[PDB]
Amino acid sequence: MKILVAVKQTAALEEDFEIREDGMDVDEDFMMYDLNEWDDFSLEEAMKIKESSDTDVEVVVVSVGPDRVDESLRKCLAKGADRAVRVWDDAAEGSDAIVVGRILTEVIKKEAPDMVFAGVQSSDQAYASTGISVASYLNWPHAAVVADLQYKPGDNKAVIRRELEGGMLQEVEINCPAVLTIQLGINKPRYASPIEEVSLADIGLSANDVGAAQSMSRVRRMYIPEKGRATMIEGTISEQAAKIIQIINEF
């Protein structure tokens, strides 16, 4: 039995960040990197399956990214992932969700897992696209926004609950193997705060298959928009709290 979990190391911006001089991205100096929040839940779900099974389950985490991503992969291993795989070449710079989908699929074909888990979306770009793209390239059954999974290793069907707008869920019976995008809250990750390197040649791809040029949208510019501004209440706690109380009553 094998479960493959695709994970992303996301970037969050420090205060007072600036746009690069070319206007196409934020300056790298203002980025802090960590594992995508959705991926904590996806990994924990794979590990719950491993734990429940009296049979052997290999949990492999895979990320497409440059060498900074090793930090996140090592932490995944420390939490119990069996193996961790990083895929990269410089030519892959700027690969969008659909191209990442393609690269992950080339890895998954060689790994031949029994299920593939991905997060619902990334906290940085929130494409909510990558995992379902992998499903399309694999031509596998898929479901997005999975809040519950009833699955035994080697079954040929699973029952999932997908989380809808307003709070309702929908139970769906799905053929396995399947790609599932996993939602926040499906479980409680228990550790709340070598790596195998793969090149494009290893997976039969070239420069012309990956990167910004092969992406489905072209970035014209990134910029900091004018946004709504609150009326900031300055002063001590007592006056800030007084302000709030004056607001509460006028209501």
Partner: protein
């Protein structure tokens, strides 16, 4: 040219984002002579023809596939066949849980442009230009689609205004491609309630409260204020307050609320979906960069525990 809009329904009811996409499409098209084609997909979808026979709809296509409600395999095949039939320059999907189950699968197969969760869209000359967020909504990312004859966008809910009035589309019926789906829909489920946060005055707590033993002091603050205690998602995911008190896209929209006090809540898009309409929003957050400040009327950059204790003292 044609713009194709995919409507959305669930549990016999049309979702209102459908009419938002129709407004978007009508705002977007380059000439009065361009047509907006709306498709509704489902084995019982004829029921929706009255609700989709509205201002701005030129053609309305009812697609009968094998399932009553959303199925990713049926929707991908059906939308693929609609694009083939209508040659649209732009296809608009809602950025919804259903669309997450197939939009990027539909785009992977093809020569189409694609972008998700779009909140600005226009033509500059003949060039379609779409804007979406980046870096947890700290920037706008403006994109175009060089040499793409067909662009698929998913559109952020509650941005585009619906048109008013009836319409008289040409209505047609098609069968979905004969695809045996690889999943089957089973029951809807409402998970296992004291208040209905369609109430007037809310104090809402987020991840900033830190630990479950800190919930009680807020429940006591709300008690004494006359507010109802609600939360953002992480609080309910942790089981600290019931899912019934969760505000946002997969929780409740607080439709009656006039004063909403957001404490240690960053203001994610999904949280804002539930509360951004509130006339007076106060945010209390130690991070001045938090998105919540972009919709709040009043902002206090302070520690929530210090404010809470003072607030309780002054009350």
């Amino acid at each position: 040219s044609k713009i194709l809009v995919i409507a959305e329904h669930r549990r016999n009811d049309l979702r209102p984002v459908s009419l938002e996409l129709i407004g978007a499409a009508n705002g977007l098209k380059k000439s009065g002579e361009d047509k907006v084609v709306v498709a509704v997909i489902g084995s019982q979808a004829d029921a929706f023809v009255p609700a989709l026979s509205v201002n701005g709809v030129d053609e309305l296509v009812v697609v009968k596939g094998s399932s009553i409600d959303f199925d990713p395999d049926v929707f991908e095949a059906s939308v693929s066949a609609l694009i083939a039939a209508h040659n649209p320059s732009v296809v608009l999907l809602p950025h919804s849980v259903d669309s997450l189950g197939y939009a990027s699968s539909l785009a992977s197969k093809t020569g189409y442009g694609f972008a998700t969760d779009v909140y600005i869209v226009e033509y500059q000359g003949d060039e379609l230009v779409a804007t979406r967020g980046g870096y947890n909504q700290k920037v706008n990312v403006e994109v175009d689609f060089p040499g793409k004859s067909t662009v698929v966008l998913t559109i952020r809910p509650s941005v585009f205004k619906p048109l008013e009035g009836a319409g008289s589309p040409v209505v047609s019926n098609v069968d979905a491609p004969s695809v045996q789906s690889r999943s089957q829909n089973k029951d809807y489920v409402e998970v296992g309630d004291i208040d209905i946060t369609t109430v007037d005055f809310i104090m809402s707590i987020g991840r900033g409260i830190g630990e479950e033993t800190n919930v009680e002091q807020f429940r006591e603050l709300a008690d004494e204020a006359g507010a109802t205690l609600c939360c953002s998602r992480p609080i309910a995911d942790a089981g600290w307050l019931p899912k019934s008190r969760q505000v946002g896209q997969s929780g409740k929209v607080v439709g009656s609320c006039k004063l909403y006090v957001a404490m240690g809540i960053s203001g994610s898009i999904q949280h804002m979906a539930g509360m951004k309409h509130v006339p007076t929003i106060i945010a209390v957050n130690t991070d001045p960069g938090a998105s919540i400040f972009t919709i709040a009327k009043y902002g206090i950059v302070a520690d929530i525990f210090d404010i809470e204790e003072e607030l309780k003292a002054q009350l």
